[PDB]
Amino acid sequence: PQAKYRHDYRAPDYQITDIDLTFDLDAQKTVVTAVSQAVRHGASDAPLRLNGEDLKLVSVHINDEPWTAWKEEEGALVISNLPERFTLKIINEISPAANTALEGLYQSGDALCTQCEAEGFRHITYYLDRPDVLARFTTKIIADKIKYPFLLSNGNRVAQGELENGRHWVQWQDPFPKPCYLFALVAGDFDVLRDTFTTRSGREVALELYVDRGNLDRAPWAMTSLKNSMKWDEERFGLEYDLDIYMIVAVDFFNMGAMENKGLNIFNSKYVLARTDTATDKDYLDIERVIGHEYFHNWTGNRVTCRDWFQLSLKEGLTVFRDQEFSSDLGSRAVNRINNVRTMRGLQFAEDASPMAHPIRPDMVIEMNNFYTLTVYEKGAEVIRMIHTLLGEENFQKGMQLYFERHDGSAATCDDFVQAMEDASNVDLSHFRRWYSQSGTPIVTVKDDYNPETEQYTLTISQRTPATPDQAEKQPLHIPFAIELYDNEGKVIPLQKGGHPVNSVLNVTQAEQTFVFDNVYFQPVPALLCEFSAPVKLEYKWSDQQLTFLMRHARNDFSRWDAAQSLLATYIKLNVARHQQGQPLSLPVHVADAFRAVLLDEKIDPALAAEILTLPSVNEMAELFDIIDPIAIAEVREALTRTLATELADELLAIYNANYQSEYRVEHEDIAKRTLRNACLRFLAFGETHLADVLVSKQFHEANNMTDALAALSAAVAAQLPCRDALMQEYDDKWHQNGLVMDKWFILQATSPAANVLETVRGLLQHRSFTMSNPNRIRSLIGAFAGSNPAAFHAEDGSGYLFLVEMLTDLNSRNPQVASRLIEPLIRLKRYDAKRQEKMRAALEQLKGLENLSGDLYEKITKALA
Ligand SMILES: CCCCC[C@H](CC(=O)NO)C(=O)N[C@H](C(=O)N1CCC[C@H]1CO)C(C)C
Ligand code: NA
Ligand SMILES: [Zn+2]
């Protein structure tokens, strides 16, 4: 299993311009006939080297001549002595039924469907499976009519027929040249929700959502979100859809969230199906964002694609930026930003310090499916956001316009995109490019000085990025460092120097620099790194009062939330050290009072209050520490919850009651009120036991929507309340036939604070709603245990590790992509104490020694054991 390197990129020796596919479909044996029009660009004597994996080759012809000058090697069909232009015809067989990895053509229940990204099409036929080869596809699909009455591929229907013996066929053509990773095929029996969207220029688009028979009741929100996405891309980016039909198919068996195949997106049904009794507000907004994301790819990914897979962030950073902007414009910008920042600081920063650390544009890759990462996606988006901060919206949209004008219809690089932005805007991004090539999280240290004699305020700012396992050398970045300065009354002080305004985005470009501001009439309280203006750790010595001041006065809701996080961080760290010495929680009264004030402030947006009243996750808390003590973190989180619930009990109950809503709606104001009310409930669950039990049980039984029901259920679990077992059993009895709804319950089981959680989780491997064959079930029971219950996962006896080894031993052979996401908690070993490291290292060594170790796991294990 050999690494590939970004610096080895070279243009292909051959292009394929047009490919005509025929599939004779059957679950046990599918026959694929692929006719490709090829053109040699390289040297006359260069062979054509086609990728192929797990294919039974039947025949190879070149301009209808059966070919002799070829050989099959590991992963390849190498064809020699070719003309400059020719027709390649390959026939091969594949077996969808055998495909447990869900890569290429496989079964999802009784349907047949595909996943081709990154390198899945080579599991369907021998091809130039690289994204700089763009070809016009036509696809003919032949199958049993009764089993597969819908035969779908990319584009428009151009032919159809019926055959003997109950078989029929449909042929598709997609006029836009595409890399094969955007190829899709679906065959099966579906219900279909049909609607239309008319673009601003008048193009009428047929919209078609394919779902399992009986799920039409759960389709309209996804349809609505598709229309919303299309309207927003027109309004915000000036982009219209480019075809006549937009098909989405919801499948139950899917490794990823969803996939942007041109005109034929395939979605994990988790990101399509919603009804108010099955899906929470969070599920609705996740459906919205994922529908949006895949739609947005139509331009940022499909009309301009990636030259090579090292450029993955070109499409994923930018499309995630777009989906954040969509969510943020339609809903709560603050809540979106807060949550994306929680992901960055609490999950992405952990990756960037891990053995799998990489730059957003990686340099070295063994298995490309391991690089669909928090770094490439979330940090990628923060990098795009920095360009947006640096340029402003108008210049940023100029750069988008120049990027498409230059690269529409082509496969481009990250560097191309930066250059478009630089050239359209006239902002120099030469230094900024280092964000693409350097891994690790910068640490920005800020000191300040106020000089009352000159009425000057000086910020002394320094940066450094620690070495990471992948890179021994680090250099300063171009860090956009947004500030705001507050006077004694909470009014913003104008930034100026030497009689001229100073932009509030400071260009932090050196290891150390000073910024001086004049006409500073009063010693300021600064708001620093406003709206998380760069993806960096900030070191500033905040007083508690400065932070509670920001919580009361800061102009941007994000700053209020961020000040609350810094206030809490001090006391989370305090109490973890106390826990380790056997001492109980200590919290100053004035800290509790700051959160009391948030609860009682009628002018604060309830969306914001809810977030201030949501404590950092155990993952976010881990980032605060040089060495992670997951048991101390978990216990402190609970103790803090309990302490706040006791101190704020009256106020909590008052606000809980005030935000009661008898109507359920999926509307942002309503969602914000529910989030507040349920943030209150979480604390109240940890108050006096009898009142808690009654309140929680009543909300579960009386809820008219899954948001409120699950919030109660989840609090019964979190607080180990008396009603917990009865409510958990009620939910199983009602919902066990519905895997998506049971995922929520598997997550609660996996994240339970109960002493016997591992025993329960193992027992649920045999539950009626669980199956090892379904990625969502795996992720919900097993992934949630390992990733979201680190206290149990990291049980001192090593039992969590042993359990993960067993599961991984199965998944390594069944579904390497799912296995590789699941191993991630084990690769963080060097963050833990020595005895945990020894046990985790022993587990990794066991997996290293597996017969038939997948490349997916091999890459991660080798980095971890280094
Ligand atoms: C809003 C965009 C996110 C959904 C889609 C992406 C895939 C993609 O980029 N499609 O264009 C995805 O699956 N992402 C992964 C993900 O969200 N997954 C993977 C398994 C299911 C789902 C939730 O964990 C992460 C972990 C990279
Ligand atoms: Na065929
Ligand atoms: Zn994407």
Is the domain of 515 the same as that of 525?
A: yes
SS (H, E, C) 771-810: CCCCHHHHHHHHHHHHHHCHHHHCCCCCHHHHHHHHHHHH
Whole-angstrom distance, CA of residue 770 vs CA of residue 388: 44
Q: Is there a domain that residue 2 lies in?
A: no
Token pair of 677 as six digits:
């009310």
Say if ligand 1 is within 6 A of residue 708 CB.
Answer: no
Whole-angstrom distance, CA of residue 749 vs CA of residue 730: 14
Say if ligand 1 is within 6 A of residue 788 CB.
Answer: no
Is residue 194 within 8 A of residue 205, CB to CB? The reply is: no
Say if ligand 1 is within 6 A of residue 745 CB.
Answer: no
- Residue bearing tokens 């929470």: 280
Which contiguous run of DSSP H or E holds residue 491?
none
Is residue 407 within 8 A of residue 304, CB to CB? The reply is: yes
Is the domain of 243 the same as that of 305?
A: no
> Which residue CA neighbors atom 1 of ligand 1 most closely?
290
Domain end (from 240, 275, 310): 275
Is the domain of 74 the same as that of 143?
A: yes
Q: Which residues surround ligand 3, an ion (CB under 5 A)?
A: 316, 319
Say if ligand 1 is within 6 A of residue 784 CB.
Answer: no
Tell whether 257 is in a known binding site: yes
Is the domain of 373 the same as that of 522?
A: no
Domain end (from 397, 418, 439): 439
Say if ligand 1 is within 6 A of residue 257 CB.
Answer: yes
**CATH code of 770's domain:** 1.25.50.10
What is the length of the chain?
A: 866
DSSP 312: H
Whole-angstrom distance, CA of residue 318 vs CA of residue 325: 10
Whole-angstrom distance, CA of residue 416 vs CA of residue 439: 20
Q: What ligand 1 atom has the least distance to the C-alpha of 376? A: 27
> Which residue CA neighbors atom 24 of ligand 1 most closely?
257
Radius of gyration of the chain (CA): 28
Q: Ligand 1: which of 103, 182, 252, 256 to mutate, most ligand atoms within 8 Å of CB?
A: 256
CB-hemisphere CA count at 13 Å for 850?
Answer: 22
Is the domain of 145 the same as that of 84?
A: yes
Whole-angstrom distance, CA of residue 141 vs CA of residue 556: 55
DSSP 471: B
Ligand nearest to the Cα of 323, by number: 1
Whole-angstrom distance, CA of residue 410 vs CA of residue 75: 27
Whole-angstrom distance, CA of residue 527 vs CA of residue 552: 12
Looking at residue 759, its amino acid is: E
The CA 295 to ligand 1 mean position distance, Å, reads 14
Is residue 224 within 8 A of residue 193, CB to CB? The reply is: no
Q: Is there a domain that residue 162 lies in?
A: yes
Q: Is there a domain that residue 4 lies in?
A: no
Is residue 848 within 8 A of residue 865, CB to CB? The reply is: yes
Q: Is there a domain that residue 170 lies in?
A: yes
Is the domain of 344 the same as that of 473?
A: no
Helix, strand, coil share (%) of the chain residues, nearest 5: 45, 20, 35
CA-wise closest residue to 416 among 318, 298, 534, 533 = 318
Q: Which residues contact 200 (CB under 8 A, 6 or more apart)?
A: 234, 240
Looking at residue 576, its amino acid is: V
Tell whether 316 is in a known binding site: yes
Is the domain of 462 the same as that of 508?
A: yes
CA-wise closest residue to 289 among 237, 334, 325 = 325
Sheet containing 456-464: which strands, arranged edge to edge? 512-517, 456-464, 443-451, 537-539
Whole-angstrom distance, CA of residue 105 vs CA of residue 98: 10
**CATH code of 398's domain:** 1.10.390.10
Token pair of 104 as six digits:
């290429």
- Backbone phi, then psi, for 501, in 5-degree steps? -65, 150
Whole-angstrom distance, CA of residue 846 vs CA of residue 863: 15
The CA 430 to ligand 1 mean position distance, Å, reads 31
Q: Is there a domain that residue 1 lies in?
A: no
Ligand nearest to the Cα of 820, by number: 1
Q: Is there a domain that residue 363 lies in?
A: yes
Q: Is there a domain that residue 741 lies in?
A: yes
Is the domain of 183 the same as that of 212?
A: no
Torsion angle (degrees, nearest 10) of CA 281, 282, 283, 287: 100
Domains of the chain: total? 5
Tell whether 512 is in a known binding site: no
Q: Give 334-356 as a DSSP string.
A: HHHHHHHHHHIIIIIHHHHTSTT
Say if ligand 1 is within 6 A of residue 89 CB.
Answer: no
Strands 156-162 and 167-173, sheet pairing: antiparallel
Whole-angstrom distance, CA of residue 397 vs CA of residue 402: 9
Burial of 531 (0-12, 13-18, 19+ CB in 10 A): middle
Ligand nearest to the Cα of 125, by number: 2
Its sign, for the CA torsion 544, 545, 549, 554, is negative
3-class DSSP state of 513: strand
Is residue 79 within 8 A of residue 50, CB to CB? The reply is: yes
Torsion angle (degrees, nearest 10) of CA 264, 269, 270, 272: 60
**CATH code of 254's domain:** 3.30.2010.30
Burial of 394 (0-12, 13-18, 19+ CB in 10 A): exposed
3-class DSSP state of 705: coil
Whole-angstrom distance, CA of residue 174 vs CA of residue 820: 34
Say if ligand 1 is within 6 A of residue 322 CB.
Answer: no
Q: What ligand 1 atom has the least distance to the C-alpha of 259? A: 10
3-class DSSP state of 85: strand
> Which residue CA neighbors atom 26 of ligand 1 most closely?
373
The CA 257 to ligand 1 mean position distance, Å, reads 4
Token pair of 149 as six digits:
């009455």
Is residue 585 within 8 A of residue 634, CB to CB? The reply is: no
Say if ligand 1 is within 6 A of residue 256 CB.
Answer: yes
Whole-angstrom distance, CA of residue 663 vs CA of residue 660: 9
Is the domain of 294 the same as that of 430?
A: yes
Helices 689-702 and 724-735, packing angle to 10 deg: 10
CB-hemisphere CA count at 13 Å for 799?
Answer: 13
Say if ligand 1 is within 6 A of residue 416 CB.
Answer: no
CA-wise closest residue to 587 among 562, 629, 615 = 615
In terms of residue numbers, what domain contains 253?
191-275
The CA 167 to ligand 2 mean position distance, Å, reads 14
Whole-angstrom distance, CA of residue 193 vs CA of residue 177: 28
Q: Which residues pair with 641 in a beta bridge?
A: none
Its sign, for the CA torsion 133, 135, 141, 147, is positive
Burial of 272 (0-12, 13-18, 19+ CB in 10 A): buried
> Which residue CA neighbors atom 20 of ligand 1 most closely?
256
- Backbone phi, then psi, for 153, in 5-degree steps? -145, 180
Catalytic status, residue 65 = no
Torsion angle (degrees, nearest 10) of CA 830, 833, 836, 838: 70
Is residue 446 within 8 A of residue 461, CB to CB? The reply is: yes
> Which residue CA neighbors atom 4 of ligand 1 most closely?
257
Q: Is there a domain that residue 614 lies in?
A: yes
CA-wise closest residue to 673 among 724, 747, 768, 607 = 607
- Backbone phi, then psi, for 653, in 5-degree steps? -70, -35
Is the domain of 220 the same as that of 206?
A: yes
**CATH code of 33's domain:** 2.60.40.1730
> Which residue CA neighbors atom 12 of ligand 1 most closely?
257
Is residue 664 within 8 A of residue 709, CB to CB? The reply is: no
Q: Which residues pair with 192 in a beta bridge?
A: 210
Domain end (from 439, 465, 495): 439
Is residue 691 within 8 A of residue 650, CB to CB? The reply is: no
Residue of 53, 103, 208, 294 marked active site: 294
Tell whether 621 is in a known binding site: no
> Which residue CA neighbors atom 19 of ligand 1 most closely?
256
Whole-angstrom distance, CA of residue 394 vs CA of residue 233: 15
Is the domain of 513 the same as that of 549?
A: no
What is the distance in angstroms between the CA of the first residue and the CA of the last residue of the chain? 17
Tell whether 632 is in a known binding site: no
Say if ligand 1 is within 6 A of residue 260 CB.
Answer: yes
Whole-angstrom distance, CA of residue 593 vs CA of residue 551: 12
Strands 56-62 and 85-94, sheet pairing: antiparallel
Burial of 28 (0-12, 13-18, 19+ CB in 10 A): exposed
Its sign, for the CA torsion 302, 308, 314, 320, is positive
Say if ligand 1 is within 6 A of residue 294 CB.
Answer: yes
- Backbone phi, then psi, for 461, in 5-degree steps? -115, 130
Which contiguous run of DSSP H or E holds residue 38?
strand 30-40
Tell whether 484 is in a known binding site: no
Whole-angstrom distance, CA of residue 21 vs CA of residue 380: 35
CA-wise closest residue to 615 among 537, 547, 679, 671 = 679
Is residue 529 within 8 A of residue 444, CB to CB? The reply is: yes
Helices 689-702 and 706-718, packing angle to 10 deg: 150
Whole-angstrom distance, CA of residue 173 vs CA of residue 135: 12
- Backbone phi, then psi, for 110, in 5-degree steps? -95, -5
Burial of 233 (0-12, 13-18, 19+ CB in 10 A): buried
Q: What ligand 1 atom has the least distance to the C-alpha of 290? A: 1
Q: Give 720-787 as a DSSP string.
A: T-TTHHHHHHHHHHHHTT-HHHHHHHHHHHHT---TTHHHHHHHGGG-TT--TT-HHHHIIIIIHHHH
Is the domain of 396 the same as that of 295?
A: yes
Is residue 564 within 8 A of residue 551, CB to CB? The reply is: yes
Tell whether 455 is in a known binding site: no
DSSP 240: -
Experiment type: X-ray
Strand ranges for 360-494 from DSSP E: 364-365, 410-412, 443-451, 456-464, 479-486
DSSP 556: S
- Long-range CB pairs of 828-831, under 8 A, 24+ apart, other chains included: 828/350, 828/354, 828/628, 829/864, 830/355, 831/350, 831/353, 831/622, 831/627, 831/628
Phi-psi region of 60 (alpha: psi -120 to 50; beta: other; left: phi over 0): beta
